[PDB]
Structure 1
Amino acid sequence: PEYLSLFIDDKLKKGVKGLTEQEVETILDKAMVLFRFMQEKDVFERYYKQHLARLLTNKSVSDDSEKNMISKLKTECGCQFTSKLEGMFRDMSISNTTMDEFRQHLQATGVSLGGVDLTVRVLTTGYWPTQSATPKCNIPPAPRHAFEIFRRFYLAKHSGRQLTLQHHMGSADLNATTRKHILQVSTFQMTILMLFNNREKYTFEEIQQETDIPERELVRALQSLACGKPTQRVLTKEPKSKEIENGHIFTVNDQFTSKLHRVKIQTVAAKQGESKVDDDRKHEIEAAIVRIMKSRKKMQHNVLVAEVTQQLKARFLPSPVVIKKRIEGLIEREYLARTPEDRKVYTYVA
Structure 2
Amino acid sequence: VYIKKVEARINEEIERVMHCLDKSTEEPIVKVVERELISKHMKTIVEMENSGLVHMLKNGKTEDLGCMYKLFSRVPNGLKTMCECMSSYLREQGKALVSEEGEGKNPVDYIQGLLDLKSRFDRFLLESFNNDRLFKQTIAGDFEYFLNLNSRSPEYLSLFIDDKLKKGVKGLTEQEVETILDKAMVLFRFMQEKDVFERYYKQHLARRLLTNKSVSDDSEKNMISKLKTECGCQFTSKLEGMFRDMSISNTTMDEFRQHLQATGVSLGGVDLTVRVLTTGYWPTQSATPKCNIPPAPRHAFEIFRRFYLAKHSGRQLTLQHHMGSADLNATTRKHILQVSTFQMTILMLFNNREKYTFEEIQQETDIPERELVRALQSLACGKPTQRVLTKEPKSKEIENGHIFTVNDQFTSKLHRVKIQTVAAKQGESDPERKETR
Alignment of 1:23-102 (within 5 A): 23-54=176-207, 55-102=209-256
In the superposition, relative to structure 1, how do residues 253 and 21 fare at CA in structure 2: closer, same or farther (>3 Å)?
closer
Distance 2:391 2:199 in 1: 40
One-letter amino acid of the structure 2 residue matched with residue 203 of structure 1: T
Q: CA deviation at 1:76?
A: 2.6
**Structure 2 CA distance for partners of 1:250 and 1:122, relative to 1, 3 Å:** same
Which ranges of structure 2 fall in alignment gaps of 5 or more residues?
A: 1-153, 430-434
Summarize the alignment of residues 99-248 of structure 1 with structure 2, pairs less than 5 Å apart: 99-248=253-402
Q: Could you tell me how far apart the structure 2 residues matched to 1:222 and 1:106 are? A: 33
Instruction: Name which of 173, 178, 185 aligns with 1:20.
Output: 173
Deviation at 1:48, TM superposition (A): 1.6
Give the 3-state SS of the residue equivalent to 1:95 in structure 2: helix
Name the CA distance, whole Å, in 2 between partners of 1:273 and 1:181.
Answer: 32
1:258–1:133 Cα change, 3 Å: closer
Corresponding residue for residue 305 of structure 1: none
Distance, in Å, in 1 between the alignment partners of 2:295 and 2:345 is 11
Q: 1:273 to 1:35 in 2, by over 3 A?
A: closer
Following superposition, the deviation at residue 199 of structure 1 comes to 0.9
Q: 1:274 to 1:222 in 2, by over 3 A?
A: farther
- Deviation (angstroms), 1:153: 0.6
Task: Describe the shift of the 1:257–1:24 C-alpha distance in structure 2 as closer, same or farther (beyond 3 A).
Answer: closer
Give the TM-score taking structure 2 as reference length.
Answer: 0.59
> How far apart in 2 are the matches of 1:63 and 1:114?
30
Provide closer, same or farther for how the CA distance between residues 9 and 60 of structure 1 changes in structure 2, counting only shifts above 3 A.
farther
Uncovered stretches (5+) of structure 1, i.e. residues with no partner: 276-280, 282-350
Structure number with bigger Rg: 2
Q: CA 1:139–1:233 in 2, change beyond 3 Å: closer, same or farther?
A: same
* 1:64 CA drift (Å): 2.5
1:135·1:166 contact (CA, 8 Å) conserved in 2? yes
Residue 268 of structure 1 and its aligned partner are, at CA, apart by 3.1
Q: How high is the sequence identity, in percent, across the aligned residues?
A: 100
Answer whether contact 1:106 1:114 (CA < 8 A) is retained. no
* Cα distance change on mapping 1:249 and 1:274 into 2, 3 Å: farther
Greater alpha carbon shift after TM alignment, 219-228 vs 113-122: 219-228
SS at match of 2:182: helix
Measure the CA separation in 2 of the matches of 1:242 and 1:89: 42
Segment drifting more, 87-96 vs 64-73: 64-73
Question: Aligned partners of 1:212, 1:272: CA distance in 2, in Å?
Answer: 29
Question: C-alpha displacement at 1:19, in angstroms?
Answer: 2.6
Deviations 1:196-232 (A, max 9, x none): 1111211111111122323232343233222321232
- 1: CA distance, partners of 2:378 / 2:428: 12
Q: Secondary structure at the match of 2:267?
A: helix
Matches of residues 224-303 of structure 1 in structure 2 within 5 Å?
224-270=378-424
Q: CA deviation at 1:271?
A: 5.2
Instruction: Go from structure 1 to structure 2 and tell me whether the alpha carbon gap of 1:274 and 1:69 turns closer, same or farther (over 3 Å shift).
Output: closer
Q: Number of residues paired by the alignment?
A: 276
RMSD in angstroms over aligned alpha carbons?
A: 2.2
Matches of 2:333 and 2:168, distance apart in 1: 36
Which residue identity is paired with 1:33? V
Question: In the superposition, relative to structure 1, how do residues 274 and 74 fare at CA in structure 2: closer, same or farther (>3 Å)?
Answer: closer
1:163 partner SS:
strand
Change (3 A) 1:258 1:126: closer
* CA–CA distance in structure 2, aligned partners of residues 123 and 196 of structure 1: 32
Please tell me whether the aligned partners of residues 234 and 256 of structure 1 are also in contact (alpha carbons under 8 angstroms): no
Q: Which amino acid aligns with 1:36?
A: R
Name the structure where helix makes up a greater proportion of residues: 2
Q: Is this contact kept in 2: 1:87–1:127, CA < 8 A? A: yes
Between the aligned partners of 1:132 and 1:74, the Cα distance in structure 2 is: 29
User: Quick one: higher RCO (CA 8 Å, sep 6+), 1 or 2?
Assistant: 1
Of 257-266 and 161-170, deviating more is: 257-266
The CA distance in 1 between the partners of 2:183 and 2:428, in whole Å, is 30
SS of residue matched to 2:393? coil
Amino acid at match of 1:52: L
* Equivalence for 2:123: none
Match of 1:3 in 2: 156
- Aligned to 1:208, what secondary structure does the other structure show? helix
Aligned-partner Cα distance in 2 for 1:258–1:139: 27
Residues 273-317 of structure 1: CA distance to partner in whole angstroms, max 9, x if unpaired? 786xxxxx9xxxxxxxxxxxxxxxxxxxxxxxxxxxxxxxxxxxx
1:177–1:254 CA contact under 8 A, matched in 2? no
